Design a protein around this nucleic acid. Structure first.
Ligand SMILES: [Mg+2]
Length: 175
DNA sequence: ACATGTGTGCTAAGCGCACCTAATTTCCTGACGGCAATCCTTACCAGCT
């Protein structure tokens, strides 16, 4: 039911702010290709912010600092960050996840869904890029978003996250 | 910012100072006043176009 602009999914592109104009963008007008939409959906479970204290965040109240091991190789990247935990979880690429008991696991929190995304496609679409830069085919128009209120409790520690001693997520301190 | 306009015709050398001397005390300020805003929302709802 709730429909927002697809430009708010990719946080770098300005959205329907409280302004008559934006940084030379306009919602429901500028196209966006499949690749950037799809790699912008990967930023939902891990980099979702507060939407005015009534719209919920991700598995953390604020997007935490992420510390992580880098390597020259993709095999080296995957191998150097292999530290597992005994819990399994339920990742979102399965169907509806089972709530069950608390401490849901690791693959469940890696693929947590704070917001439903459905998307919609009109009678074909565009003919060239207008916001991405890579000239693609008929692009998408807008996205659909809703809010899942994350239930209270849910004791969960992030493998890459940086956590305060009081349990709140640690945000970057740049103003 | 010496020279130079001499025009009968304009010198010149020796010589130029040493020494004692300069002080203290204390005094020195309290108080009151010190800016607010606005540069992303628990967002729908009702005054009315
Ligand atoms: Mg692209």
């Amino acid at each position: 039911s709730r429909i927002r602009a697809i430009t708010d999914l990719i946080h770098e592109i300005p959205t329907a702010h409280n302004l008559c104009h934006f940084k030379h963008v306009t919602d429901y007008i500028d196209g966006l290709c499949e690749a950037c939409c799809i790699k912008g959906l990967l930023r939902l479970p891990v980099f979702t912010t507060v939407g005015g204290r009534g719209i919920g965040a991700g598995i953390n109240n604020t997007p935490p600092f992420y510390l992580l091991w880098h390597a020259n190789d993709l095999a080296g990247m995957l191998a150097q960050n292999w530290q597992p935990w005994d819990n399994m979880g339920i990742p979102a690429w399965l169907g509806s996840f089972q709530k069950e008991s608390r401490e849901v696991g690791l693959l469940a929190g890696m693929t947590w869904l704070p917001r439903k995304v459905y998307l919609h496609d009109p009678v074909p679409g565009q003919a060239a890029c207008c916001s991405c830069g890579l000239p693609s085919e008929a692009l998408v128009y807008s996205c659909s978003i809703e809010v899942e209120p994350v239930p209270k409790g849910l004791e969960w520690k992030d493998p890459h996250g940086v956590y305060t001693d009081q349990g709140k997520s640690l945000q970057s301190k740049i103003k």
